[PDB]
Design a protein around this ligand. Structure first.
Ligand SMILES: [Zn+2]
Ligand SMILES: [Zn+2]
Lengths: 57, 69, 44
């Protein structure tokens, strides 16, 4: 569905972590450039610090 | 947080003077000593109670769990 | 009505064996409301 912004007050009240999704796009290269398979992979919810450029405050 | 009812040292009721102190500071251009004297605070024990009050209740009140923000 | 949404602050009644969420918005945190009860104190 459509996601909604989460602010650290909710993380504090829920007694859980305040983390954002981390995405790496792998390069499944074969034979030095014969063909490359690309696929972004989510690698868990990475914690972020407050008041940073990746925080909603 | 909110103004104390009485002075800690002597016990004089100073809880009814915080709003008047702010009025005399804002409307009238009174310095703090003059405003405290004109409120009737002569002892420095009573003067400090109003001269040094912080009034954090106003900042507390902005976080209201009972009204949509 | 015994609960308050932690974000939109709208009073909501949560029945037993029911989803714990605000009906208006999608918030899963609810605050128990304080109802009228006798609570003695000493003015000291
Ligand atoms: Zn005094
Ligand atoms: Zn709600």
């Amino acid at each position: 569905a459509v996601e909604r912004k989460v602010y650290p007050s909710e993380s504090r009240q829920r007694l859980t972590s305040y983390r954002g999704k981390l995405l790496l796009k792998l390069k499944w290269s074969v034979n030095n450039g014969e063909e490359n398979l690309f696929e972004v992979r989510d690698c868990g919810g990475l914690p972020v610090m407050l008041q940073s450029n990746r925080c909603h405050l | 947080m909110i103004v104390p009812v009485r002075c800690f040292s002597c016990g004089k009721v100073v809880g009814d003077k915080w709003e008047s102190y702010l009025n005399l500071l804002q409307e009238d251009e009174l310095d703090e000593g003059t405003a405290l004297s004109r409120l009737g605070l002569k002892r420095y024990c009573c003067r400090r109670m109003i001269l040094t009050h912080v009034d954090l209740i106003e900042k507390f009140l902005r976080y209201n769990p009972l009204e949509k923000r | 009505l015994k609960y308050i949404c932690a974000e939109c602050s709208s009073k909501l009644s949560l029945s037993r064996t029911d989803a714990v969420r605000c009906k208006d918005c999608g918030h899963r945190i609810l605050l128990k409301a304080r109802t009228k009860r006798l609570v003695q104190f000493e003015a000291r």
